């Protein structure tokens, strides 16, 4: 109930929220059906439009006007945004040359530069270049401020998950808004775009910027705008708030535009109808900047121009129907469109089986435009699994397509020509970032970055301590003139042991054999040096990784590679090796095919054993440093140590072997040497975080050898590829992956073919940031470089996407 009998007189767009049933006057009352009777009359005036004309100058203040051209309007904070241009011979902000803003130039009584977030829905990254002719104001912000060529949204590339990720710095799996539509089985409640449940606070996890600000004493404008409030009124309201007394005035503001997304859905991303909505957004930016100029705030306020996601060409005829695959199509509920999420229609159906549903959806048609996954098998870069609202069965839909349950869902629910929601690496989904103000840099381009990083920067901009989030604080310091956050490297928690030769061959009973009984202080003093780390500077280029949790591990040196061997998990946590451009690939000699050798530095009780692999009919083994890349026949024996071995499904060894035998040398050839760090990942509860030992759900049969869910590699070289990876004097270049360690290759529909037709495509799909690997391993990489820590943080957040040029 609301007793809408009160008045909005003097309360228009009040900043505190009064509780029911007293009537509301804030920018959300419309959405609550709770505005006072006179809200429209007093608060949404429209008389005379939004611009001053020549004949309005000096007018007698008529309070019925939407905005004013009377002489007192500046001090009342309520002029039309073009007032000084029309009436006082001033120029529009867009017409002024830009001049570097070296220091904030603020009116007295401003404690900090205000932050305005100008967020635009569905603003595709390529609009910046492609619409540049019709967007002068946006183009000026972009060229004069700090801009990236694009910003990466989160998956799914829908509106609510992305706006709430911007506000919180959290992955949707952690913030809770995992789609525009959701079912929460614990609540037994459903969230939708239309309706009242979405207003219920229980959906919204983490701590958004306006709450962070408020709790730390920084006042916030109200971020959310009712759809019926026109853009011009939103701008005038922000500008009015900026004229409030010091003690009442917010320091942070948001404006939101439903465009260009609204029109993009109807006309496609580049429909000729898209020019007008872009002009219109630009005009709104012009109104804000002119308004700021009038208030002498245009060299005081930091302005962020940011989108939530892009827009792709999608039409009704590009829909895949689950009814063409499933016999039991009515026993499932599908969340449909540019992604799919499947659950059982009824929990009382014990004949529901996800395994049969996935098999029915797997590689069933030659050109199939979606791929099913159990959510824990999605590419880890998507971080889309750890939430009860994310259904176990997921469909990754090809760009330009939809999935639907049955044809009747499409024609009785072409309308649309654009949509979004696809994999967040897709070019058409990328969106925009521009920062302009005293705290941002001048005329600076920065590399693409992920929208999860911005919350930290928005906190930096307002002098706030960010709540715990998924950004990497410091990774975006290169965007800022000042206010940078100078992070320290985390402290190593576990220091390594450096074992020497401690065990005789006969102490081992591992069931392993090797044909290595083939025999000189020339070569024998030399091999001693190699086991003490004589070549360590070659294979460990950036310092050893730090272990950030309590564990027991050994550093093991070899001619061709160095490892950090976990006595707890019985395998390396990491194996580091450098492959120069000149390196040669050899094969495993016939006699050495099944050779496994005990490691005399490491006790039998802390070693794997070959018998377990013999007994386990499902599990084979691979090596972390590949025998193929050994520097010499004698060095090759090192690669067969039991301490270099890891458990691998035969199906996965097809992937791993091709990577090691073909791709590493290809990368070294292309990048002028590479340093590789590889190892196991255990993430059985799919939370993106390293498992403890008591979380492991699978072991090699009859043993304590834990089975990785994934294997990673980090491949580093010199950004300037004229320098070899092992003699690099400047910035680095990295690509990484986290491959799912799966007993089949069902994911790759082309896997019956030669590895050269499908393995690299798989790897590309499972590209990852070094940071993703850090979370999954509890390791910290790049501890010893000549680079600044902030630059290394940026490197650790890099994702090699394999998309073409934007
Ligand atoms: C991205 O960044 C984020 C943020 O930093 C990372 O997420 C954090 O990770 C932490 C480790 O997983 C986690 O810490 C836990 O907190 C528990 C208390 O959490 C509540 O309070 C916080 C603080 O206000 C709040 O944020 C939480 O909100 C969650 O839950 C509600 C809904 O229930 C949502 O509104 C919200 O969206 C959020 O949900 C997300 O997180 C939860 C996990 O908390 C997931 O289940 C959801 O799917 C969703 O993703 C909470 O309101 C605390 O209880 C935990 O402590 C347990 O474990 C420790 C081990 O150290 C042990 O000492 C304790 O005894 C305890 O164990 C007991 O409980 C067990 C489980 O019930 C039980 O099995 C045992 O037997 C014991 O009884 C733990 O410390 C932190 O909450 C989240 N924060 C957020 C916002 O998600 C995230 O990891 C990053 N991602 C990556 C890849 O890096
Ligand atoms: O327009 C849509 N929905 C309408 C809204 O609900 C209206 C109210 N609103 C708002 O006022 O924005 C608040 C905000 C702004 C910035 C921000 O970013 C931050 F925090 F970083 F500043 C954080 C929060 C949110 C969007 C919509 C769009 C595209 C679609 N495609 N398919 N369906 C769709 C539905
Ligand atoms: Ca885990
Ligand atoms: Cl959704
Ligand atoms: K086996
Ligand atoms: Na296959
Ligand atoms: Zn949309």
Tab-separated table of C-alpha atoms and ligand atoms in Angstrom, residues 363 745-752, ligand 6:
chain	number	residue	atom	x	y	z
A	363	UNK	CA	27.542	-33.111	-32.469
A	745	UNK	CA	36.870	-35.434	-26.802
A	746	UNK	CA	33.088	-35.055	-27.213
A	747	UNK	CA	33.577	-31.295	-27.031
A	748	UNK	CA	35.421	-31.370	-30.363
A	749	UNK	CA	33.065	-32.651	-33.093
A	750	UNK	CA	36.082	-33.094	-35.421
A	751	UNK	CA	38.174	-35.207	-33.039
A	752	UNK	CA	38.161	-38.428	-35.118
B	6	LIG	NA1	34.699	-35.675	-30.647
